[PDB]
């Protein structure tokens, strides 16, 4: 079986529709998500268009290997989707109404700049390769493009599941292709980050700043160096779930700043001590007293500047 | 082969039954569990209803590709279930008695608020999509809805395996669907948490409070900072098996409180020292003496308030 | 094809035999092991019992889809086994001699109480569901129940592979089932635990007890607190390969005891210091001197009591 | 169906073309990458060359199991590729135009010497084994050798996807083979390494050098030893994503140098202290003062020498 | 189709040959390696031996499901191999020349005693089960037993790929089996271990020995205890890629020795301090001075003794 012939020279319009059933396993590091949905396909095939006079049926149900079915694929997938045909039903005009339930691992990249406050647009690209006798173009039937209310993506708020109605028609290996953009907008649930990651990581850094109210080099060494060890240990605990990005992250910049703040604090502790031992207690005291206001104020402004630059 | 026709306009009732054989691999982070069970299906098909007069058989056993079998699927699954048909037997009225043994990775969310004292309700959603000629509705045969006595879910106490008898009939992509709720109630085995996690994590925090019986800033710095490092290391050891939740956890709140308690203790140690060095030993001593009662009492009340709020 | 009819009312006896080829991947945390073995089945089917007079064959070899074969399954499996039929051969009396090579992930629970000195009994449950016309019962042919000499389970000593000859006949979903218990006895290789885990973990705890020969609170704080950090780090290094058990482990109890011993040592160090500073050096010295004998003696007896209770 | 016969003695030329659709999962440790692409094959088969006079078709579309198709395989693959035939179309001269969409895990080694500034050349080896009647040779159709604009390999910059036009014809197990080299040039995105790995790891090492401005052995011991612990912890945090190489890495050498620099600093701290205690403060002071310039200058030159040797 | 009959009573000799294409993923912990190779099989079947007079062919090429092919399996595999038949060609005498390309996960145990200087012998066991009419025996065609020059096993040097020519004929479940031993000799690339693991781990231990040139108990406590923490952290960093062995490893013994050396050093530090405080400075000094020579000399000899015992 090959494709239905045109009346004139018109291409075959395959009306599409993706309905999300289950959506899960969003791997931040791999920039992949797993989706279990319904794929809806519709096209007219006059060859199987029959008369409600003679035909012993009103709606003719077929098996997938009895009629011509368009080779519809996904662009951004790891391997081909695990699809199970649900129903194929031909209306007397020849209109085929295909439906399958598929599960696929979609490969859509993410923007980690505004992390962990970020929002993403996940993409599902439907494609059809035009054939010898008839050229095939994709379309969006917005009545069969949706999502189940129960759909849950852990740590994210599902905003919308839509499709860019106009297909991307282009040439690929001497044949026309029709690509459709199914967009899934999601926004990260950042509550947990504040009391679980941000606040304990700020407390450890604040502990080091107590060395600006001490003259004991032994106590100061223990303070700044031990908190630096606590910091690294905390970051080990709090995992690492992001890939290596070519760009700079909001969180990326803050972390670097914190490592710089540990280094500067050591320099201060060292400077204060050297002046004190080299009989210059006024300079040693003035530097320590200044640092008490300097370190928090600089930290505050630097975070404000960064926040502004990223948001 | 398509569905049996009605006598009037009545829908086809498919009686269902899930019998748990093996239940395992409950992934807290992924909110998934693996299940190996029996799926029982029963429906009347008059087309294959024959006479115990003529028929050379008493009970007619068939192969799955000889008779019409309803397309029964699971809603909350990763990929389609790995099922192996056990037996199909037609009674001479046409009553089909289908049975298969399946294994599926079910995707049912969890509530981590009362963790590690929590209890869950796992869901297994059976679905049937109604077809062109005949509409299909699901039913519960409570005589074939159960669980094997040996069924073990490591770290959980299996309470019950039941089914919500009334199906959820609704419209989806221009056709009727019939959904059934199979509920698996489980309650976490929290013994281990008390001597393995809770008690050692409380001991490390209690060690820091010994700085309220010392005047040695060097000893106090080592006490509060080193125990903070021990705390983080202990938490690294004791793993992290929960996802990022939009809500706040009982354990989540207590942990944050402990990080705050390390910070407050540092402030005290720093305050006591600054007053002592700035020739105010009475204030330095009164603050330390108060902290001896303050820190445990505040901790006790805060834990009581939290416990009350979560339970 | 359905089952052979009885001469009278006798059930069909299917003689079984499992022969272990490869045995591996014993996951302590998941309580699963992977097995690659031979499954041997034998039953009489008079329908295919032919005469050595006429028959142009002496031993008739068949294809699995030419003759009736009993639906034999495993109870405690994740998914159904990957089996490849090796040989089916019918003797003139009708005796079928079936043989397949299968690989399955078996789900058998473990008792971690006596860990790492423990011994386990792994279970492989063979099952057959009786059918409409003929009831089916399982049997053990002990001549085809064995294991390959080379079979290796890393870190365990394979003691025996046997079968409980009497099957467990019971009712399940209105039909009889015949269950067979194939037991695989294994005993843990505990050598490594003594010099790699037990001894280094005891050395770190012994280091803390040197604070009973010091009067330097700074040295004592560093001793007890730093060794506690070393302890946790060591346990992080030495992994965590056991699940969360409802019961208490021999190793579980010892670990808790060690955390208690770190806490008590801190109390001592704190007590000795407070008395010394509050001008009571005799009490401070008597407590320290006592602890020198107290801490090791109590530890020794407590370990003896626990060892006795678990073994 | 076997191969088309030659007109004379000429071998069958199979024109090839790989078009990258999705490229991902580059495992540095495993030296593997996953690829989803189009495989294009073209050859003349006069047996199916038909006349545009009689033939009721203009372009004859076939099924893969209707015509002879060359056995094309990949050399450096884990398992055989998951390919799905897209289109087979015969032109009247007999020219077959085959196209499939495949996904394979390619096994191409990497050079970690210049890491993390490295560049790689990934290889995809196409092979065809010549047969009894006709010998088969591979060719490159550069019009169907490309990559999708969207193709993204996280942490790498895709430079080019080309093919070495001249095939590698050789003998293997008494038959000719024709191998084609598809090269994928990639260059690592090293930005992240500077502020996330290099700079914090340099700060910790610089902290240790402050012991050259102190005379307190207690402070110096804490400085050099604690920073060494911070260093190791940081490296644990920053993962380990490279295999065990027979050669020496740029990063490999620098790391070893840093461990040597921690050791030398300890020796200095120990030397300075021993001279000071053995009443030689001039030697103790001269060594410390020298080290202030020595340690950074030596480090700078050593890094310059290494950088030169590797780049 | 069943096996070719004998002329007399002779068994069927199946000539074998494994040619390594890709060899990779050697999992030390799992004692498994993945192999992609060519399997060559040859046997005479007179039934298909045809006359170069009548036969319209010179070399008859067949499809696998047209002729009898021996059921050849691998003993030490996880699951059955993923094989794709490359070519089957019958010579006029009846000699069949079979060839397939397979990928399998081989399960061959390892000896970790001499690790990381160890050498292994990997095993690939070919087996054939004799059948009813004809008994089957295996043979080695050494002209088709080899390896591709490009074959790379990361971190290992491939020494040789050979086969034990004499097969292991034995009885298994009432039938004869013929087993062939394909041996793959490999030797570990130990360069990396010296500057990356051995040397940094020796430096940390040498740092602790500086406490033999100090009288400061506070400095000594920090030295020996902090280096012990650095040691454990280093070992965490440097991974753990070996299983739990019943025997003792060369590396295993050295590690235990290092933990003992940390313990003994603490004892010394404690002893020196107690004598010094109990007004015995001569004994305290003699012990410290001795330890300066004792600790390195004992370490040197112990390593020499161990090295001798393992190599
Ligand atoms: Cl697809
Ligand atoms: Cl399903
Ligand atoms: Cl099974
Ligand atoms: Cl391939
Ligand atoms: Cl195999």
PDB file of C-alpha atoms in Angstrom, chain C residues 4-218:
ATOM      1  CA  UNK C   4      -3.813 -34.631  27.956  1.00  0.00           C
ATOM      2  CA  UNK C   5      -6.981 -36.239  29.384  1.00  0.00           C
ATOM      3  CA  UNK C   6      -6.701 -38.502  32.516  1.00  0.00           C
ATOM      4  CA  UNK C   7      -7.182 -42.364  32.442  1.00  0.00           C
ATOM      5  CA  UNK C   8      -9.398 -41.986  35.531  1.00  0.00           C
ATOM      6  CA  UNK C   9      -9.392 -38.639  37.452  1.00  0.00           C
ATOM      7  CA  UNK C  10      -5.609 -38.448  38.263  1.00  0.00           C
ATOM      8  CA  UNK C  11      -3.833 -35.025  38.055  1.00  0.00           C
ATOM      9  CA  UNK C  12      -0.970 -34.366  35.600  1.00  0.00           C
ATOM     10  CA  UNK C  13       2.436 -34.677  37.323  1.00  0.00           C
ATOM     11  CA  UNK C  14       5.070 -32.373  35.842  1.00  0.00           C
ATOM     12  CA  UNK C  15       8.525 -33.490  37.053  1.00  0.00           C
ATOM     13  CA  UNK C  16      10.805 -30.432  37.472  1.00  0.00           C
ATOM     14  CA  UNK C  17      14.549 -29.731  37.723  1.00  0.00           C
ATOM     15  CA  UNK C  18      16.588 -26.512  37.949  1.00  0.00           C
ATOM     16  CA  UNK C  19      20.337 -26.719  37.085  1.00  0.00           C
ATOM     17  CA  UNK C  20      22.366 -23.538  37.943  1.00  0.00           C
ATOM     18  CA  UNK C  21      24.785 -22.457  35.192  1.00  0.00           C
ATOM     19  CA  UNK C  22      25.587 -18.878  36.246  1.00  0.00           C
ATOM     20  CA  UNK C  23      24.651 -17.195  39.484  1.00  0.00           C
ATOM     21  CA  UNK C  24      25.596 -13.553  40.139  1.00  0.00           C
ATOM     22  CA  UNK C  25      24.495  -9.902  40.956  1.00  0.00           C
ATOM     23  CA  UNK C  26      23.286 -10.421  44.576  1.00  0.00           C
ATOM     24  CA  UNK C  27      22.020  -6.908  45.542  1.00  0.00           C
ATOM     25  CA  UNK C  28      21.958  -6.778  49.385  1.00  0.00           C
ATOM     26  CA  UNK C  29      19.930  -3.481  49.378  1.00  0.00           C
ATOM     27  CA  UNK C  30      17.347  -4.785  46.836  1.00  0.00           C
ATOM     28  CA  UNK C  31      17.296  -8.393  48.236  1.00  0.00           C
ATOM     29  CA  UNK C  32      17.549  -9.682  44.607  1.00  0.00           C
ATOM     30  CA  UNK C  33      19.975 -12.007  42.762  1.00  0.00           C
ATOM     31  CA  UNK C  34      20.334 -12.849  39.071  1.00  0.00           C
ATOM     32  CA  UNK C  35      20.313 -16.488  37.934  1.00  0.00           C
ATOM     33  CA  UNK C  36      21.029 -18.190  34.542  1.00  0.00           C
ATOM     34  CA  UNK C  37      19.978 -21.876  34.706  1.00  0.00           C
ATOM     35  CA  UNK C  38      18.378 -24.915  32.989  1.00  0.00           C
ATOM     36  CA  UNK C  39      14.693 -25.687  33.542  1.00  0.00           C
ATOM     37  CA  UNK C  40      13.794 -29.363  33.030  1.00  0.00           C
ATOM     38  CA  UNK C  41      10.187 -30.470  32.598  1.00  0.00           C
ATOM     39  CA  UNK C  42       8.717 -33.973  32.106  1.00  0.00           C
ATOM     40  CA  UNK C  43       5.110 -35.247  31.733  1.00  0.00           C
ATOM     41  CA  UNK C  44       3.254 -38.091  29.960  1.00  0.00           C
ATOM     42  CA  UNK C  45       0.975 -37.254  27.039  1.00  0.00           C
ATOM     43  CA  UNK C  46      -0.551 -40.468  25.541  1.00  0.00           C
ATOM     44  CA  UNK C  47      -1.897 -38.484  22.563  1.00  0.00           C
ATOM     45  CA  UNK C  48       1.675 -38.347  21.184  1.00  0.00           C
ATOM     46  CA  UNK C  49       2.658 -41.805  22.466  1.00  0.00           C
ATOM     47  CA  UNK C  50       3.454 -43.692  19.276  1.00  0.00           C
ATOM     48  CA  UNK C  51       4.389 -47.231  18.096  1.00  0.00           C
ATOM     49  CA  UNK C  52       8.053 -48.136  17.428  1.00  0.00           C
ATOM     50  CA  UNK C  53       6.568 -50.429  14.730  1.00  0.00           C
ATOM     51  CA  UNK C  54       4.957 -47.885  12.309  1.00  0.00           C
ATOM     52  CA  UNK C  55       6.604 -44.557  13.424  1.00  0.00           C
ATOM     53  CA  UNK C  56       9.518 -43.630  11.117  1.00  0.00           C
ATOM     54  CA  UNK C  57      11.243 -42.279  14.261  1.00  0.00           C
ATOM     55  CA  UNK C  58      12.665 -43.771  17.449  1.00  0.00           C
ATOM     56  CA  UNK C  59      12.623 -40.522  19.516  1.00  0.00           C
ATOM     57  CA  UNK C  60      10.336 -37.822  18.124  1.00  0.00           C
ATOM     58  CA  UNK C  61      11.762 -34.297  18.447  1.00  0.00           C
ATOM     59  CA  UNK C  62       9.160 -31.492  18.340  1.00  0.00           C
ATOM     60  CA  UNK C  63       8.929 -27.696  18.118  1.00  0.00           C
ATOM     61  CA  UNK C  64       7.312 -25.891  21.176  1.00  0.00           C
ATOM     62  CA  UNK C  65       4.300 -24.797  19.018  1.00  0.00           C
ATOM     63  CA  UNK C  66       3.464 -28.367  17.775  1.00  0.00           C
ATOM     64  CA  UNK C  67       2.663 -29.883  21.188  1.00  0.00           C
ATOM     65  CA  UNK C  68       0.898 -28.853  24.481  1.00  0.00           C
ATOM     66  CA  UNK C  69       3.443 -27.554  27.046  1.00  0.00           C
ATOM     67  CA  UNK C  70       2.529 -26.706  30.714  1.00  0.00           C
ATOM     68  CA  UNK C  71       2.525 -22.993  31.673  1.00  0.00           C
ATOM     69  CA  UNK C  72       5.310 -23.035  34.315  1.00  0.00           C
ATOM     70  CA  UNK C  73       6.161 -19.697  35.985  1.00  0.00           C
ATOM     71  CA  UNK C  74       8.314 -18.301  38.816  1.00  0.00           C
ATOM     72  CA  UNK C  75       6.599 -16.609  41.774  1.00  0.00           C
ATOM     73  CA  UNK C  76       9.335 -14.352  43.194  1.00  0.00           C
ATOM     74  CA  UNK C  77      10.557 -12.731  39.924  1.00  0.00           C
ATOM     75  CA  UNK C  78      10.742  -9.025  38.854  1.00  0.00           C
ATOM     76  CA  UNK C  79       9.606  -9.616  35.239  1.00  0.00           C
ATOM     77  CA  UNK C  80       9.007 -12.947  33.426  1.00  0.00           C
ATOM     78  CA  UNK C  81      12.158 -15.029  32.689  1.00  0.00           C
ATOM     79  CA  UNK C  82      14.067 -14.848  29.359  1.00  0.00           C
ATOM     80  CA  UNK C  83      13.878 -18.522  28.377  1.00  0.00           C
ATOM     81  CA  UNK C  84      15.142 -20.215  25.181  1.00  0.00           C
ATOM     82  CA  UNK C  85      13.879 -23.766  24.535  1.00  0.00           C
ATOM     83  CA  UNK C  86      16.867 -26.118  24.173  1.00  0.00           C
ATOM     84  CA  UNK C  87      15.140 -29.485  23.426  1.00  0.00           C
ATOM     85  CA  UNK C  88      11.710 -31.219  23.398  1.00  0.00           C
ATOM     86  CA  UNK C  89      11.766 -35.004  22.819  1.00  0.00           C
ATOM     87  CA  UNK C  90       8.844 -37.489  22.964  1.00  0.00           C
ATOM     88  CA  UNK C  91       9.474 -41.126  23.930  1.00  0.00           C
ATOM     89  CA  UNK C  92       7.098 -43.816  22.414  1.00  0.00           C
ATOM     90  CA  UNK C  93       5.001 -44.077  25.740  1.00  0.00           C
ATOM     91  CA  UNK C  94       4.164 -40.370  25.337  1.00  0.00           C
ATOM     92  CA  UNK C  95       6.716 -39.090  27.867  1.00  0.00           C
ATOM     93  CA  UNK C  96       7.767 -35.559  26.896  1.00  0.00           C
ATOM     94  CA  UNK C  97      11.266 -34.435  27.866  1.00  0.00           C
ATOM     95  CA  UNK C  98      11.385 -30.622  27.748  1.00  0.00           C
ATOM     96  CA  UNK C  99      14.494 -28.485  28.478  1.00  0.00           C
ATOM     97  CA  UNK C 100      15.025 -24.701  28.327  1.00  0.00           C
ATOM     98  CA  UNK C 101      17.826 -22.309  29.362  1.00  0.00           C
ATOM     99  CA  UNK C 102      16.471 -19.277  31.300  1.00  0.00           C
ATOM    100  CA  UNK C 103      17.782 -16.101  32.976  1.00  0.00           C
ATOM    101  CA  UNK C 104      15.687 -14.362  35.700  1.00  0.00           C
ATOM    102  CA  UNK C 105      16.061 -11.695  38.452  1.00  0.00           C
ATOM    103  CA  UNK C 106      14.876 -13.492  41.606  1.00  0.00           C
ATOM    104  CA  UNK C 107      13.440 -11.498  44.542  1.00  0.00           C
ATOM    105  CA  UNK C 108      14.326 -13.358  47.791  1.00  0.00           C
ATOM    106  CA  UNK C 109      14.484 -11.427  51.131  1.00  0.00           C
ATOM    107  CA  UNK C 110      17.519 -11.493  53.471  1.00  0.00           C
ATOM    108  CA  UNK C 111      18.051 -11.522  57.298  1.00  0.00           C
ATOM    109  CA  UNK C 112      20.682  -8.880  58.174  1.00  0.00           C
ATOM    110  CA  UNK C 113      20.665  -9.501  61.976  1.00  0.00           C
ATOM    111  CA  UNK C 114      23.963 -11.536  62.086  1.00  0.00           C
ATOM    112  CA  UNK C 115      25.629  -9.340  59.341  1.00  0.00           C
ATOM    113  CA  UNK C 116      28.500  -9.467  58.274  1.00  0.00           C
ATOM    114  CA  UNK C 117      28.701 -13.042  59.671  1.00  0.00           C
ATOM    115  CA  UNK C 118      25.195 -13.922  58.264  1.00  0.00           C
ATOM    116  CA  UNK C 119      24.022 -16.889  56.146  1.00  0.00           C
ATOM    117  CA  UNK C 120      21.115 -16.805  53.696  1.00  0.00           C
ATOM    118  CA  UNK C 121      18.602 -19.183  52.096  1.00  0.00           C
ATOM    119  CA  UNK C 122      17.668 -17.930  48.655  1.00  0.00           C
ATOM    120  CA  UNK C 123      14.328 -19.097  47.258  1.00  0.00           C
ATOM    121  CA  UNK C 124      13.231 -19.884  43.688  1.00  0.00           C
ATOM    122  CA  UNK C 125       9.480 -20.662  43.571  1.00  0.00           C
ATOM    123  CA  UNK C 126       8.218 -22.740  40.617  1.00  0.00           C
ATOM    124  CA  UNK C 127       4.469 -22.571  40.022  1.00  0.00           C
ATOM    125  CA  UNK C 128       1.856 -24.222  37.685  1.00  0.00           C
ATOM    126  CA  UNK C 129      -1.769 -23.147  37.414  1.00  0.00           C
ATOM    127  CA  UNK C 130      -4.215 -26.104  37.005  1.00  0.00           C
ATOM    128  CA  UNK C 131      -6.560 -25.882  33.994  1.00  0.00           C
ATOM    129  CA  UNK C 132     -10.301 -26.553  33.121  1.00  0.00           C
ATOM    130  CA  UNK C 133     -10.051 -30.224  31.920  1.00  0.00           C
ATOM    131  CA  UNK C 134      -6.970 -31.428  33.925  1.00  0.00           C
ATOM    132  CA  UNK C 135      -5.467 -30.378  37.303  1.00  0.00           C
ATOM    133  CA  UNK C 136      -1.628 -29.994  37.329  1.00  0.00           C
ATOM    134  CA  UNK C 137       0.774 -30.880  40.216  1.00  0.00           C
ATOM    135  CA  UNK C 138       4.603 -30.312  40.414  1.00  0.00           C
ATOM    136  CA  UNK C 139       7.310 -32.891  41.326  1.00  0.00           C
ATOM    137  CA  UNK C 140      11.116 -32.919  41.965  1.00  0.00           C
ATOM    138  CA  UNK C 141      13.427 -35.076  39.790  1.00  0.00           C
ATOM    139  CA  UNK C 142      16.543 -34.828  42.058  1.00  0.00           C
ATOM    140  CA  UNK C 143      18.808 -36.189  39.259  1.00  0.00           C
ATOM    141  CA  UNK C 144      18.296 -32.923  37.291  1.00  0.00           C
ATOM    142  CA  UNK C 145      18.477 -30.521  40.359  1.00  0.00           C
ATOM    143  CA  UNK C 146      22.056 -29.266  40.662  1.00  0.00           C
ATOM    144  CA  UNK C 147      24.657 -26.586  40.012  1.00  0.00           C
ATOM    145  CA  UNK C 148      27.725 -26.106  37.786  1.00  0.00           C
ATOM    146  CA  UNK C 149      31.038 -26.621  39.638  1.00  0.00           C
ATOM    147  CA  UNK C 150      32.258 -23.128  38.434  1.00  0.00           C
ATOM    148  CA  UNK C 151      29.147 -21.214  39.842  1.00  0.00           C
ATOM    149  CA  UNK C 152      30.487 -18.184  41.795  1.00  0.00           C
ATOM    150  CA  UNK C 153      28.616 -15.636  43.912  1.00  0.00           C
ATOM    151  CA  UNK C 154      31.241 -12.918  44.826  1.00  0.00           C
ATOM    152  CA  UNK C 155      31.659 -12.512  48.620  1.00  0.00           C
ATOM    153  CA  UNK C 156      29.556 -15.627  49.401  1.00  0.00           C
ATOM    154  CA  UNK C 157      30.196 -19.361  49.810  1.00  0.00           C
ATOM    155  CA  UNK C 158      27.571 -21.415  47.901  1.00  0.00           C
ATOM    156  CA  UNK C 159      26.595 -24.174  50.392  1.00  0.00           C
ATOM    157  CA  UNK C 160      23.830 -26.091  48.512  1.00  0.00           C
ATOM    158  CA  UNK C 161      21.131 -25.949  45.824  1.00  0.00           C
ATOM    159  CA  UNK C 162      18.209 -28.219  46.773  1.00  0.00           C
ATOM    160  CA  UNK C 163      14.422 -28.429  46.430  1.00  0.00           C
ATOM    161  CA  UNK C 164      11.657 -29.143  48.991  1.00  0.00           C
ATOM    162  CA  UNK C 165      10.264 -32.332  47.311  1.00  0.00           C
ATOM    163  CA  UNK C 166       6.699 -31.899  48.648  1.00  0.00           C
ATOM    164  CA  UNK C 167       4.916 -29.172  46.597  1.00  0.00           C
ATOM    165  CA  UNK C 168       2.667 -26.515  48.134  1.00  0.00           C
ATOM    166  CA  UNK C 169      -0.764 -27.208  46.609  1.00  0.00           C
ATOM    167  CA  UNK C 170      -3.309 -24.409  47.253  1.00  0.00           C
ATOM    168  CA  UNK C 171      -6.306 -22.508  45.819  1.00  0.00           C
ATOM    169  CA  UNK C 172      -5.874 -19.133  44.059  1.00  0.00           C
ATOM    170  CA  UNK C 173      -8.607 -17.226  42.095  1.00  0.00           C
ATOM    171  CA  UNK C 174     -10.953 -20.321  41.892  1.00  0.00           C
ATOM    172  CA  UNK C 175      -8.143 -22.691  40.617  1.00  0.00           C
ATOM    173  CA  UNK C 176      -5.441 -24.999  42.105  1.00  0.00           C
ATOM    174  CA  UNK C 177      -1.732 -24.003  42.052  1.00  0.00           C
ATOM    175  CA  UNK C 178       1.313 -26.255  42.734  1.00  0.00           C
ATOM    176  CA  UNK C 179       4.359 -24.403  44.161  1.00  0.00           C
ATOM    177  CA  UNK C 180       7.900 -25.838  44.527  1.00  0.00           C
ATOM    178  CA  UNK C 181      10.611 -24.459  46.817  1.00  0.00           C
ATOM    179  CA  UNK C 182      14.115 -24.391  45.269  1.00  0.00           C
ATOM    180  CA  UNK C 183      16.494 -23.348  48.065  1.00  0.00           C
ATOM    181  CA  UNK C 184      19.977 -21.887  47.516  1.00  0.00           C
ATOM    182  CA  UNK C 185      21.978 -21.804  50.797  1.00  0.00           C
ATOM    183  CA  UNK C 186      24.794 -19.231  50.916  1.00  0.00           C
ATOM    184  CA  UNK C 187      27.157 -18.051  53.731  1.00  0.00           C
ATOM    185  CA  UNK C 188      28.945 -14.656  53.727  1.00  0.00           C
ATOM    186  CA  UNK C 189      32.787 -14.454  53.361  1.00  0.00           C
ATOM    187  CA  UNK C 190      33.505 -12.165  56.375  1.00  0.00           C
ATOM    188  CA  UNK C 191      37.379 -12.128  56.272  1.00  0.00           C
ATOM    189  CA  UNK C 192      37.692  -8.666  54.599  1.00  0.00           C
ATOM    190  CA  UNK C 193      35.458  -7.034  57.303  1.00  0.00           C
ATOM    191  CA  UNK C 194      38.001  -7.615  60.121  1.00  0.00           C
ATOM    192  CA  UNK C 195      41.134  -5.772  58.734  1.00  0.00           C
ATOM    193  CA  UNK C 196      39.282  -3.433  56.301  1.00  0.00           C
ATOM    194  CA  UNK C 197      36.254  -2.254  58.320  1.00  0.00           C
ATOM    195  CA  UNK C 198      36.219  -3.494  61.982  1.00  0.00           C
ATOM    196  CA  UNK C 199      39.902  -2.855  62.932  1.00  0.00           C
ATOM    197  CA  UNK C 200      40.353   0.711  61.391  1.00  0.00           C
ATOM    198  CA  UNK C 201      36.948   1.694  62.910  1.00  0.00           C
ATOM    199  CA  UNK C 202      38.164   0.439  66.289  1.00  0.00           C
ATOM    200  CA  UNK C 203      41.487   2.311  66.047  1.00  0.00           C
ATOM    201  CA  UNK C 204      39.686   5.723  65.534  1.00  0.00           C
ATOM    202  CA  UNK C 205      37.536   5.025  68.656  1.00  0.00           C
ATOM    203  CA  UNK C 206      40.652   3.998  70.635  1.00  0.00           C
ATOM    204  CA  UNK C 207      42.385   7.300  69.614  1.00  0.00           C
ATOM    205  CA  UNK C 208      39.558   9.265  71.361  1.00  0.00           C
ATOM    206  CA  UNK C 209      40.256   7.385  74.637  1.00  0.00           C
ATOM    207  CA  UNK C 210      43.752   8.957  74.811  1.00  0.00           C
ATOM    208  CA  UNK C 211      41.932  12.079  76.238  1.00  0.00           C
ATOM    209  CA  UNK C 212      41.892  10.126  79.557  1.00  0.00           C
ATOM    210  CA  UNK C 213      45.710  10.687  79.798  1.00  0.00           C
ATOM    211  CA  UNK C 214      45.514  14.462  79.064  1.00  0.00           C
ATOM    212  CA  UNK C 215      44.452  17.575  81.102  1.00  0.00           C
ATOM    213  CA  UNK C 216      44.568  19.926  78.050  1.00  0.00           C
ATOM    214  CA  UNK C 217      40.888  20.744  77.248  1.00  0.00           C
ATOM    215  CA  UNK C 218      42.046  22.079  73.820  1.00  0.00           C
TER     216      UNK C 218
END
